[PDB]
Amino acid sequence: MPVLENRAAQGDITAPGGARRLTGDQTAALRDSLSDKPAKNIILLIGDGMGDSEITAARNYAEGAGGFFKGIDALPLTGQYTHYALNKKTGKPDYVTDSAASATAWSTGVKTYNGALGVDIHEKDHPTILEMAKAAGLATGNVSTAELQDAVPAALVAHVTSRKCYGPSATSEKCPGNALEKGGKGSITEQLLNARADVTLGGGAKTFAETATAGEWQGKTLREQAQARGYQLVSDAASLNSVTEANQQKPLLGLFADGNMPVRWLGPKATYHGNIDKPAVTCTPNPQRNDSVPTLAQMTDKAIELLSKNEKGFFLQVEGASIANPCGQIGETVDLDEAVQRALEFAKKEGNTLVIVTADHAHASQIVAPDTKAPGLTQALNTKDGAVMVMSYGSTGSQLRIAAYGPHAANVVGLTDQTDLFYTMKAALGLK
Amino acid sequence: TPEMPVLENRAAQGDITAPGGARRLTGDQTAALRDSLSDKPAKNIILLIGDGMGDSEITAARNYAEGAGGFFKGIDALPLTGQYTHYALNKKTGKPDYVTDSAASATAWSTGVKTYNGALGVDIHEKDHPTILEMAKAAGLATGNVSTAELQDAVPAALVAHVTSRKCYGPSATSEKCPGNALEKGGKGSITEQLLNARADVTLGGGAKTFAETATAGEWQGKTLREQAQARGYQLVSDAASLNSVTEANQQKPLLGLFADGNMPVRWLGPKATYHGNIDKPAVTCTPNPQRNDSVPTLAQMTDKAIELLSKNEKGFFLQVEGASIANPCGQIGETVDLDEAVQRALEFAKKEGNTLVIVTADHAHASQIVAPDTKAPGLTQALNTKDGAVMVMSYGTGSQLRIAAYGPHAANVVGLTDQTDLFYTMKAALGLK
């Protein structure tokens, strides 16, 4: 079912027809994109805050208005999904979710309250798509450029009443029911190590320095616990590259930064009337990025290579993290686009892989007219077109894009809910 | 048999607090979507435009009027969806201008050419290009142009007028602001004059005021534009009763309904948003506008009457319907509700007829955002009491790509990423126009 490159503007944008992204009728191409056959594998890519506005701004900046993201914009089947959370006491909708409640929704199929991971409004645990995959004998991967304790990667492996419960310390204080010494399943990091995905790659080494309060590994650091439990620990690109396999006997745990992994691009923070009062900005490469720290795309490719060895199949989630910094935000979308390209390249070759690309919720940034005097923070940027684009941040709940390629991708078209994504993945992989 | 499927119910299917309760799907959609795809000719096209109606506006309106887990039986029911880009051009450089106005965006889908902000039916060199409505008429199709805005406003005007500035409503503004287009200066005339020349079978909306102006040259010099319409054989109507009496509309007796002096009445009233309004003022419940009444047809009623009149043409018809806009949350939400009712009419017709492509989108998105209730925001905000019995806060503090959705023959051409100019080529090809 491969392709639909490319949908850049096809010609001279000032001339009749020159800004078209299509070359002819799409009925055959869309029909050819539809298959009801089993998915052997799923790759779910999440861009933090990546709603339609963020996609557009990053395209305009990095590719030009008429440009095309070869990963993000190349998925043939598209829709919009709703991501409202719940008020914990009343059960009524809360129109603006945080990352934890939204990740819980696609990870478990149950709505919840802001801050919850893997539990419902009654604080009851519900299994995750990753746990279910593993129980069925599928290989599992969990990749992020955030700290691995952050809401999105955490939601696949941890059930806690507050997303703040990173390690033993915070869990004892803020989630006493989940604390290991109080009979609970443990902190986010402890539950991560119990879950034992085949491949886990990201930031967040800091919390692994904490020591367990109880159980078999009481008094040892969580890093020592991982080593004791047979994990392959890697911390840089060379150590990652040399890994030849990852499975339940030798699961891979890559910890590539103390906190979040390095942001792709730097620029100044937006300011009051920054588009008027400050020069237009050209984003710059972050010196902290280097070939010793794997990128999101490199971690995605290595996870695919290790997980694809499982004959039954795999589930892999990849999160492009977001750390009022337009350059930071746009470079994060570029990082995600490269990871999506790796996923699509694999899926097109393998032929039984469903790739889904979406966001937890949208950032508040807006693209505004160049002369805008806005009440919040603004910045002018010099885009690939050699024109100024202005972005405004003006302290969100909108539905936002979800797109897919491969078997069962029809289930993201039209209006859906974020919880439907759980059931789509469940059904595509034939999980019970 | 009414047979390619419309989405009948994508509301949350159960108790939203329970596992699976917030699902909008009941099962796999592959078969449904396969059955949604045809490249047979479109006999008819109905294009519905919600002013400012990006994804945020759809979500806010759904939240308020239907609840978070509710469902717009029109807007949310189209099975094939994508996102399109609507950037304009800088007139002098020809480089993208990332934030369009309504005139440049309407020009893009009506003519397939990008242009500068404020341009109607002309490119950055001020050269005219034909519109989808003009092309439909030349091919023997019936044509309708319906709006709750003034008919001179950018969206309806872009189908029938080629002028260098959208401000050129009548003779007086054209001679001042678009001198090359002014009739007495050798051009094709004001927006209103070009509308009268274009002679769609059905034109319904606001904007009676400009018709009081007199022409400055030509056969009808010194007559008002209303008098000109009357002399050129138009059937003029001004309220619901007179619209209802109309039995036919065609090139001998084209229909021109003028239902307000300016814009037609908004659906709902509420207070303007204010600084720290969500904190400093009570949560708002929108109220009915008493200027709305059964003597003024609604957007849906105009849509239904236009379909009834246009569908008599054996070759087919092209119909555009605009739900107009105008930091008034209640006004903007009610406008989305108005559009949803008109989309329901269009889909009901299309489902039965079987050869009708229905497209629902926006010119460009409004700046409103849905934000946390406790938000202290620097712009204008308002708390609203929604259908769920919970508070939603709106903030007004744009260039984002936005939803386009379709049903019927050739609907596949809205899926994925497209440009607003592709919509011109989609409509052209679907109707077989050359």
Side-chain angles (χ1 to χ4, degrees), chain B residues 396-414:
Chain B
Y396 297 86
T398 58
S400 183
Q401 70 192 27
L402 57 86
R403 182 181 189 249
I404 175 166
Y407 169 81
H410 298 282
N413 295 324
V414 309

Side-chain angles (χ1 to χ4, degrees), chain A residues 225-244:
Chain A
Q225 174 180 152
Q227 185 68 33
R229 298 181 74 181
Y231 281 84
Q232 303 179 79
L233 290 152
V234 301
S235 63
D236 66 18
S239 55
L240 180 56
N241 277 333
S242 295
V243 177
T244 55

Side-chain angles (χ1 to χ4, degrees), chain A residues 172-195:
Chain A
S172 296
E173 181 183 6
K174 302 169 177 149
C175 300
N178 303 130
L180 192 64
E181 73 275 8
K182 311 188 182 141
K185 294 183 184 175
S187 64
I188 288 163
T189 306
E190 288 163 298
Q191 292 191 50
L192 184 153
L193 292 171
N194 289 337

